[PDB]
Amino acid sequence: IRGNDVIFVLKTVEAFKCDELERYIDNNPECTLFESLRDEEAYSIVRIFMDVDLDACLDEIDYLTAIQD
């Protein structure tokens, strides 16, 4: 694989590079793009990611210790 430098996005589609995506984001701040996989079988190697949502507000100290743990 040797890595991938192409990012496929869906508007609710495009295949942009790092500079291309940066320029498009700078031009359109309100555009809603979702990063996905252009081909599941070809480049299934991806990073490790997680999404966290807690409907409350925390101070700096509590957030720091909680994120460390």
């Binding site: 700096e60 100290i61 720091l64």
Partner: protein
């Protein structure tokens, strides 16, 4: 300077001989600070919060554990290389 009644009031000032034991920084913007939360002492620097990671020290209790710790502090029980304790 920090007593039993003023432990969290006076921020603790440290020396700069060695870098921070928590973040390896030579010098920090502000001195450290101690706070109490659920029977645990949190140690953290003021000013830049992300500069220093928060440390935690618990004051647990369990009288029998304290007694065991104190008896170990006197250094009366030892473990020989053969695996048998000497007192």
């Amino acid at each position: 300077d920090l007593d039993e009644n003023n432990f969290t009031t006076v921020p603790l000032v440290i020396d700069y001989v060695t870098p921070c034991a928590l973040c390896k920084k030579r010098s920090h913007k502000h001195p450290h600070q101690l706070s109490l939360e659920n029977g645990a002492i949190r140690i953290y620097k003021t000013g830049n919060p992300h500069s220093c990671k928060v440390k935690i020290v618990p004051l647990d209790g369990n009288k029998l554990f304290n007694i065991a710790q104190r008896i170990l502090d006197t250094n009366s029980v030892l473990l020989t290389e053969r695996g048998d304790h000497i007192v």
